[PDB]
Amino acid sequence: MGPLWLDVAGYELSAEDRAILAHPTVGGVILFGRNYHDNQQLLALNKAIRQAAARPILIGVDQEGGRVQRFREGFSRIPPAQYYARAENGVELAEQGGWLMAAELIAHDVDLSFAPVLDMGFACKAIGNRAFGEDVQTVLKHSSAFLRGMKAVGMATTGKHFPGHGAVIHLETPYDERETIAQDMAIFRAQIEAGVLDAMMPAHVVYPHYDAQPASGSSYWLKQVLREELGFKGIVFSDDLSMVMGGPVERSHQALVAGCDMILICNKREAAVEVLDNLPIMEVPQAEALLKKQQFSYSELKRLERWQQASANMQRLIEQFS
Numbered sequence: 001m002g003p004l005w006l007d008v009a010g011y012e013l014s015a016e017d018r019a020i021l022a023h024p025t026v027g028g029v030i031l032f033g034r035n036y037h038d039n040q041q042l043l044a045l046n047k048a049i050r051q052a053a054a055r056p057i058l059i060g061v062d063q064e065g066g067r068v069q070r071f072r073e074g075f076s077r078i079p080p081a082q083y084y085a086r087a088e089n090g091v092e093l094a095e096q097g098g099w100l101m102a103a104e105l106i107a108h109d110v111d112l113s114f115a116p117v118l119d120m121g122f123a124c125k126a127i128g129n130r131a132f133g134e135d136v137q138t139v140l141k142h143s144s145a146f147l148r149g150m151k152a153v154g155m156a157t158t159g160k161h162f163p164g165h166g167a168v169i170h171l172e173t174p175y176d177e178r179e180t181i182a183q184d185m186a187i188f189r190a191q192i193e194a195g196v197l198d199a200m201m202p203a204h205v206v207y208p209h210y211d212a213q214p215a216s217g218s219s220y221w222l223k224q225v226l227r228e229e230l231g232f233k234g235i236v237f238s239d240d241l242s243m244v245m246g247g248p249v250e251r252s253h254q255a256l257v258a259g260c261d262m263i264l265i266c267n268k269r270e271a272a273v274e275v276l277d278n279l280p281i282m283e284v285p286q287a288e289a290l291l292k293k294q295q296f297s298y299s300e301l302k303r304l305e306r307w308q309q310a311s312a313n314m315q316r317l318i319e320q321f322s
């Protein structure tokens with residue numbers, strides 16, 4: 001596995017996608033709604049991605065529930081992360097949501113969902129009900145549940161958006177000017193200390209009190225804090241670098257230098273090709289810890305009472321608070 005995550009245009013691999021997936025700088029494919037028509041087509045696409053690469057490769061998607069669930073039709077609908085703590089058995093339901101989301105992805109040959117959201121509060125329009133709660137204990141309590149469900153089916157976990165995007169309220173980059181973000185960061189600290197996060201995705205947010213760089217490209221945030229002060233041992237992602245530093249190669253290089261193990265380039269095939277063409281090849285062997293640890297089909301999954309219940313329970317929960 002190489003450092004680079006990239007994406008494809010549609011439902012099937014093109015000739016160019018195939019040549020791209022063969023390149024050892026590629027380490028993963030991130031999927032979107034546009035890569036999804038139906039269950040069968042998705043299996044077919046993921047099998048083609050794995051064939052084209054002819055080596056282990058990661059397949060990921062933003063499947064959080066609520067406002068962020070790329071694959072809905074033919075899947076169990078997963079509620080907004082916010083809903084769990086609002087039920088009377090929020091921990092129980094949040095673990096069901098996590099296991100169910102992860103289990104259905106796996107049934108469809110997807111390695112991981114980029115989740116859970118560990119941001120605190122609902123006031124940032126882009127986060128909103130994607131957050132588990134509005135205080136440290138509600139977030140920890142309910143994200144841990146969700147995260148235990150992911151782990152139970154053998155899916156690696158990615159906390160986002162480090163060090164916390166919950167308080168972001170007119171430049172190329174959002175700002176959070178509080179002189180302390182200790183509570184937001186405490187959430188991330190507890191999950192790291194508990195050893196439950198396989199990976200971390202940082203926020204594209206500047207915390208001026210702390211550092212001039214958006215956290216996603218910050219040596220302070222990604223190395224001094226994330227590694228040194230907090231002891232994170234897992235995979236650090238960058239933010240989407242297709243969006244100061246220079247062109248794609250320099251941006252990719254600054255992200256890697258800053259402390260990312262893997263970099264994402266979405267929605268810009270020519271920037272990705274420029275990076276494939278020009279970046280020296282590096283291996284990211286420790287990204288293999290992100291490959292799903294289980295294997296099964298959807299109809300095997302549906303034979304579990306655990307599935308029959310989580311599925312009915314998630315639909316019920318969505319109805320309750322919608």
Ligand SMILES: CCCC(=O)N[C@H]1/C(=N/OC(=O)Nc2ccccc2)O[C@H](CO)[C@@H](O)[C@@H]1O
Pocket residue numbers: 062114126127160161165201240242243
């Ligand atoms: C903006 C709130 C934080 C967020 O939603 N970040 C997501 C995220 N956001 O991406 C962008 O905002 N990209 C972008 C923004 C402006 C210009 C160009 C790209 O990308 C990742 C991969 O898809 C997701 O897993 C992240 O959770």
